[PDB]
Design an enzyme around this catalytic site. Sequence first.
Site, short mmCIF file in Angstrom:
data_model
loop_
_atom_site.label_atom_id
_atom_site.label_comp_id
_atom_site.label_asym_id
_atom_site.label_seq_id
_atom_site.Cartn_x
_atom_site.Cartn_y
_atom_site.Cartn_z
N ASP A 109 31.41 -39.01 73.18
CA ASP A 109 32.36 -39.87 72.20
C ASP A 109 33.64 -40.45 72.37
O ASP A 109 34.64 -40.30 72.08
CB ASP A 109 32.53 -39.11 70.97
CG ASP A 109 31.58 -38.53 70.07
OD1 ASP A 109 30.39 -39.16 70.50
OD2 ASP A 109 31.65 -37.65 69.14
N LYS A 160 37.23 -30.37 68.88
CA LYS A 160 37.71 -31.79 69.18
C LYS A 160 39.05 -32.05 68.96
O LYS A 160 39.67 -32.88 69.39
CB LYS A 160 37.02 -32.87 68.53
CG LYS A 160 35.33 -32.84 68.89
CD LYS A 160 35.08 -33.56 70.05
CE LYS A 160 33.65 -33.96 70.58
NZ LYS A 160 32.99 -32.85 70.91
#
Length: 637
Positions: free
Chosen positions: A235, A158
């Site tokens: 997300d 990420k």
Amino acid sequence: SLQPPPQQLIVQNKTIDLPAVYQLNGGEEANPHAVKVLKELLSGKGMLISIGEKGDKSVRKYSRQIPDHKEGYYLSVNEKEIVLAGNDERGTYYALQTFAQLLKDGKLPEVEIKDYPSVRYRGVVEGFYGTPWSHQARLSQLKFYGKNKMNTYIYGPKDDPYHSAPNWRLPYPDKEAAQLQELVAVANENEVDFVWAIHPGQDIKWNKEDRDLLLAKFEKMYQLGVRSFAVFFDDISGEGTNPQKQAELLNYIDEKFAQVKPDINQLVMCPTEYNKSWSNPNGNYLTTLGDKLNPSIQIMWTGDRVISDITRDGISWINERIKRPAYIWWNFPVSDYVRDHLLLGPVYGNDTTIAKEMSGFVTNPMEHAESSKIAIYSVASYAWNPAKYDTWQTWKDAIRTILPSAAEELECFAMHNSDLGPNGHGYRREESMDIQPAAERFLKAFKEGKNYDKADFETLQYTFERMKESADILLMNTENKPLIVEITPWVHQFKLTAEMGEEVLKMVEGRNESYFLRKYNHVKALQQQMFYIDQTSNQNPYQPGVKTATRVIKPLIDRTFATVVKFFNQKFNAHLDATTDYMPHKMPLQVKANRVLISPVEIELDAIYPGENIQINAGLQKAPVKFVRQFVLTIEK
């Protein structure tokens, strides 16, 4: 002791010796990755050894014994010949990896094995927040996956700016690009699909410019040797969450790229609605994906919650909306939301009868790459043979695999470093299960003032002794240095925990007033030392510091300590302080980085600091501050 356990195994109680005199057959035409391994095993060394894929001349005789499954193999060893035959090239390599585990001191058992995976894609998604795995660590991971028949490595840290927004648009700089090139070459040699993922959702525009930049990036990764690709939409918020657009982009990558190159393998996506709790059962998002996405594109799923184990009903629920078997992204042992814990327990909780209902099973691990190998080795075993998956034996095998020079010591450390503590995802693991009853009883008796069992006192005592031995031996272990470097701060905290427990137990015995006081002051020193570790190590922005043995051991120690202190205070009219965590500032206060917080009239700090702000529920512009009369005070430290 084979990991993963084969589908079918028939062992004959004889053993054979690895031939120094041997004839090799099919060497030129089998998977070269499998042959290399065979030749390393036969190093500097006539018995027949036949190796090949179904269809090769060498293994014609056994075509009916080779299982009719992707990645299947037939394996056999007897006095006269050794057979290693894969349904396909990967199968032959998997034969070799099973064969490597049978070879122990130049000796082979007599066995016949027919084997194949129950789940098609098995492996790791490096998909967590936090420091991405180092290059050397990834090199180690890819070898470990080959050894354990994991065929999938999804690259998607990420916090890699070339993976996520906004630099997902930019090609990797030369250095990172040569490293990725190397990871792909290594992946290919261990039979692992390197899957490069991209995470563009947060700032993707649904125009031609962004679409071509994405395809331009996939093209650059293709030049680096990448042959499988993923698009992640997890997300994020905003326009990137649109299910129709997501599907069109994926179908476009499919039609204009995946189905157009000569040799592309997996194409996978992760939905914005990636678990049931994050899905809208009344909204159109998942059904749109299920209906619109091309049928060869995978869809990822984490289960009923962001963090969850995979159940029959849970996966039925998703499979019925997406119209294909989910490709599981399992969020364990990822610890990016409990960064002060190591999650070193066994892999358990996933239904072991639902293989047919899943396309894939990958594990999202901790930023601690070597430490994650316990869970990863266990996931490799679960995904290959769920029917025979054995939680505790696989955990032990993993550990003895990772650190044969000190397996019991690592077992000791791992079994008291397993639970996550309270968190907003509500996920927990068992910890310290063996000693839990003894702890439980000791503290019943003690509190209510009844007498405890001696054998329970000694069990507690034996445990602390063992913890100390493990901590010290692990600290000095040079077999897996990178593992030790990862766990070291936890090891120190674990050792302190065990010393505190020994001293607290000496307080329970409590010869006399001044012994008890020596023990008591020692405990106070040990608490302060734990505080200093928790304030100086692993100072990350989210869950800073170092927690260990938190489920059963630390609470038992703390609560025992508070109790003896109270009895002593009554018995001697003393006023010993009974608080259990060291706190340098007066008022349960807490310290996190440069913050000083009363756990969700007056505070006195151990010194004058420049103050920064006070959030209850004003900026302090560097004003010197020591006294103060949610409640978080930020200072300059």
